[PDB]
Amino acid sequence: EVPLPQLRAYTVDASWLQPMAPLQIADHTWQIGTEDLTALLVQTPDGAVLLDGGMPQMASHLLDNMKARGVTPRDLRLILLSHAHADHAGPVAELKRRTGAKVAANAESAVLLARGGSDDLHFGDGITYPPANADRIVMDGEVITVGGIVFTAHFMAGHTPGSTAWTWTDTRNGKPVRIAYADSLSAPGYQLQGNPRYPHLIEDYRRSFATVRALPCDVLLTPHPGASNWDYAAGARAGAKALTCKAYADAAEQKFDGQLAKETAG
Numbered sequence: 001e002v003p004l005p006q007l008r009a010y011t012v013d014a015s016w017l018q019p020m021a022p023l024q025i026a027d028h029t030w031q032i033g034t035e036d037l038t039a040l041l042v043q044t045p046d047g048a049v050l051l052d053g054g055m056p057q058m059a060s061h062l063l064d065n066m067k068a069r070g071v072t073p074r075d076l077r078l079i080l081l082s083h084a085h086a087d088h089a090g091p092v093a094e095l096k097r098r099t100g101a102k103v104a105a106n107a108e109s110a111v112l113l114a115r116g117g118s119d120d121l122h123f124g125d126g127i128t129y130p131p132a133n134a135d136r137i138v139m140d141g142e143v144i145t146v147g148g149i150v151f152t153a154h155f156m157a158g159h160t161p162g163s164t165a166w167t168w169t170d171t172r173n174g175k176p177v178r179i180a181y182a183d184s185l186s187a188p189g190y191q192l193q194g195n196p197r198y199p200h201l202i203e204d205y206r207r208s209f210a211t212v213r214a215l216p217c218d219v220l221l222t223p224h225p226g227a228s229n230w231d232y233a234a235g236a237r238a239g240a241k242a243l244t245c246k247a248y249a250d251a252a253e254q255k256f257d258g259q260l261a262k263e264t265a266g
Ligand SMILES: C[C@H](CS)C(=O)N1CCC[C@@H]1C(=O)O
Pocket: 085, 087, 127, 184, 186, 187, 188, 224
C-alpha cells in the first residue's frame, strides 16, 4: 500500500536565507534582510518602518539588525508589504508579536496575509506561512507618513492581486533620492490566459508595467534584488548596476510576452 505524500516544506536557495549586516541605501533607508531577499528598514526620529520581512525564519535576524541600527522592538511602528507571499511576508505574524509594529496593507494583501498565503490563486496551499492581521487598510495612492518620510502606495496588481509599489523620498549627500520599492512583475508557472480565478490577469499586468515605468524612481529596489540587478553582497557597489524602473518594467513585459506565447504553444 502507498500512503499519501508527506507535506513538503517551502525550501529555497541558500542565498535567500544567508544573513547579512545592514546595508545603507540612503540616509534613513537600509537593507536588513538576507543576501537574496529584501527587507527594508526606514529609520526616522519618530520611529521605524519595515518594508517586507522575507522568509518566516528571518524574524530574529531582522530584530538583530534592527538592534544593530539602534531600533528597539518598541521603535518599530509599521510594516508595509510588497506582496503577501511566504518569502516576503513570512515573519510578519512573529514580528507583530515581538514588536510594536502594526501592518498597513491593501484589502487584497490583507486577505491573503490573513490566510497565511493559503488558497493562493496560482500556488493553492503550496507556499503557506503564519497568518497575520492587517491593522490598517490602504487605498491606491494613499500616503502614510512616519517621521517625515512619506510613503505612497502604487497598486500594481498581477503577481498577486494586492501587489504594491511603495515610493518615498530620502536623501543622500544633501540631495533628494526618490526610492521606488517596486513589487515582482513575474508570473511563475501562472496560467495567464482565461484563468477563472483571475479573469483580467493580463490587463492588470499590462497596467502594472505602465505604473512601474512611470514611478518617481531615482533608485529602484525589488523584493528579489536580482530582479532589479542589485547585488547585496557587493558592498559599496551593491546598487551600481541597478535597473531604472523603466528598464525593469520593459524587461518584465518582454518576459511576460514570451511567457504568453509559450503558454499558447503549450
Ligand atoms: C515562490 C516565489 C514567490 S515570489 C517565486 O515564484 N519566485 C521567486 C523567484 C522567482 C519566482 C518568480 O517570482 O518568478
